[PDB]
Each structure stands twice: as C-alpha cells, then as structure tokens.
C-alpha cells in the first residue's frame, strides 16, 4: 500500500500488481452500471493504489541509473 | 539590398516656382513637397563557394580593387 | 460573500471538550462539544435545542412528524471551564507527551 514491503517486489510483479487492481476496477464499473455499487470508496482507493505503484516504479527507475 | 553594406531607403521631392533672379529675386514658393524612393543594381560574385548576389554599383568599384571581405 | 474567516478557520475547542455558553439565551448552560466546524464557525453542544419538522412523503414513510435535535452556534460560548465559569488560555508546556501543548489560565486544568 505505502511502505518498503511494496517496493521490495520484482519488475514483472509491479506490472502484475498494477493490472490486478485494474481487473477489479473494471468489475466495479460493471457493478456501478448495473446498480450493485455499495462500496464507492473502494473505487477511489484502488485508483490511489495504481498511482502509488506507477509513482514508485519511476522512483526506483531513476535511482541506480543516476 | 546590396550584399556588402545594405541599401534602398529614400525620402521626399520638392518643386519650387518664381525661382531665379535678384539674389533672392522676390522669393521661391513651393508647389510640391511629395514623397520618393531611390535605388541601385546586381552582378555575380562568390566567396566561400557558389553565389550570384545583388551588387551595389558603388561597391562593384570596391571589389574591382581590393577584395573587401568578398571576391569575384 | 465571506463566512467565518473573520477568525482564522481557527477554534478554541475540540469535538470532546466541555464548554459553557456565554451570551444570548442558553447563557451559562454547559455541555460536551459533539461537532466542530472551523471554517463555518459552528459548535454542536448539548446546549441549544430545536424542534425540526420533516418534509418526508416518499422518504421512509409519510410519517414525517416533529424531531428533537440540537441547533449549532458560533463563539457565543466561551470554550473550556473548571473554576465553574468561562476563561481564556495561557500556560502550555507538555504532559507526559512532549509533542502536545496543553491549555490553562488563572488556574491550570483543561
């Protein structure tokens, strides 16, 4: 979600943990359209996770490569 | 526009009557005060490699003597 | 239009504090603070009580009678009390927690 237990993971695991949220994030949209969206907060939260993910896989890209 | 030292620009053209005579005769009255433009010419000259360019006639002289940065 | 900036979106109480109501009706009456709206300058204390009507046709039964609920105030209640009445605040330091600064006056308890 936010600490060093997130960045510690592999490169193809970062791409994997991005799309895992997106699969849910799309299912939430399909639920929203139907009228079974009792947890709207989950949508805001999942999108936040993808942001942090992409932010980090750009912090570690610049570090080492100088 | 002449290649060595740019040219073209010009000004006005007066035209008086009751002219000539007794020092200042009676006087000289103007009937013109209009507006004019004066110009120059072109010839083939090259420095560095190939170029034809516009050549100021009074700088065509300047070149027939000592090459003033450019050459024939 | 303006609104509660005349202060600094800054209050003198927390959503827990016991406060006495200085000025107006409900003068002197005390109560716990249950809602603090800093920008709006609102206080929901167990003080000023109101009888609000319910415009509720389709809204969960047409049985929308009268409701017992308390209506919010401003700075028309002097925050924090211990020598039985309203006071200012002056002496800060730390308790066991250094990071926190307490409040007190002619006495020393909040």
């Amino acid at each position: 979600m936010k600490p060093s237990e997130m960045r510690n993971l592999q490169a193809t695991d970062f791409a994997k943990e991005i799309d895992a949220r997106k699969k849910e994030l799309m299912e939430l949209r399909f639920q929203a359209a139907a009228g079974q969206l009792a947890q709207p907060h989950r949508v805001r939260q999942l999108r936040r996770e993808v942001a942090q993910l992409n932010t980090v896989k750009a912090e570690l890209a610049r570090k080492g490569e100088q | 526009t002449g290649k060595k030292n740019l040219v073209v620009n010009s000004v006005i053209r007066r035209g008086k009557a009751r002219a000539d005579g007794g020092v200042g005769r009676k006087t000289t009255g103007i009937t013109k005060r209009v507006q004019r433009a004066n110009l120059h010419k072109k010839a083939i000259r090259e420095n560095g490699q190939v170029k034809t360019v516009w050549l100021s006639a009074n700088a065509l002289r300047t070149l027939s003597k000592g090459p003033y940065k450019g050459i024939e | 239009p303006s609104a509660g900036s005349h202060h600094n979106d800054k209050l003198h109480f927390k959503k827990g504090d016991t406060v006495i109501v200085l000025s107006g009706k409900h003068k002197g009456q005390t109560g716990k603070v249950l809602l603090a709206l800093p920008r709006d300058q609102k206080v929901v204390v167990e003080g000023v009580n109101v009888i609000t009507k319910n415009v509720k046709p389709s809204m969960t039964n047409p049985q929308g009678g009268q409701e017992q609920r308390e209506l919010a105030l401003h700075a028309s209640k002097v925050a924090l009390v211990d020598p039985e009445t309203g006071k200012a605040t002056r002496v800060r330091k730390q308790i066991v927690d250094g990071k926190k600064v307490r409040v007190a006056v002619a006495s020393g308890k909040t």
């Binding site: 997106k22 994030l25 949209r29 399909f30 | - | -």
Partner: protein, 93 residues
C-alpha cells in the same frame, strides 16, 4: 491496456435480449478500434469473437439552471462469439 477500454456493459432491454443469443454489448473508449476492442474482450473474458460491429454516440442534457448543457460522447461495441458463447455469468444479470 486490456482492463481499461471496456468502460461498462450496455444495459437496456435490447442488449439483454441479445445476451440470450450469445451477443454481448459494451460501452467502449471512443478512441478504441475494432482490432483493439476485439483483443480486450477475447483476453479479459477468454472467448473467441467471430464478429464485431461498432458505432459512436453523442450526448446533450440540462434540467434547470440556465447552465447551457453539454454532450457526454460514447461508443458502443456489440460482439458475436462462436458456439462456445457466454460471458462469465455476468450475462444473467
């Protein structure tokens, strides 16, 4: 990527009656193409698309408040699959 593109499923009664024929309809990215859209469905749902027909759709409401109004702009994609039909179970909604 895969999971984006398909914004939502087409609700309505005509799509729900199409559902019954193994014909699935979706609201997709307006910029998305037929090839790109076919790929995303084939992937995310794990089913072969035997045909894709698609078309763009406009907007324009307001109710009150002389607030001009505005379009909304979508794209609807409708797909047919071979005898091995069905999407998830998210068909019998």
């Amino acid at each position: 990527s895969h999971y984006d593109i398909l914004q939502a499923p087409v609700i309505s009664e005509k799509a729900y009656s199409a559902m019954e024929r193994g014909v699935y309809s979706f609201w997709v990215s307006p910029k998305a193409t037929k090839t790109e859209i076919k790929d995303a469905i084939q992937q995310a749902f794990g089913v072969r698309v035997i045909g894709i027909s698609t078309m763009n759709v406009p907007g324009k409401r307001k109710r009150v408040g002389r607030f001009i109004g505005q379009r909304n702009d979508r794209k609807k994609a409708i797909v047919r699959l071979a005898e091995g039909q069905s999407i998830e179970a998210l068909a019998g909604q």
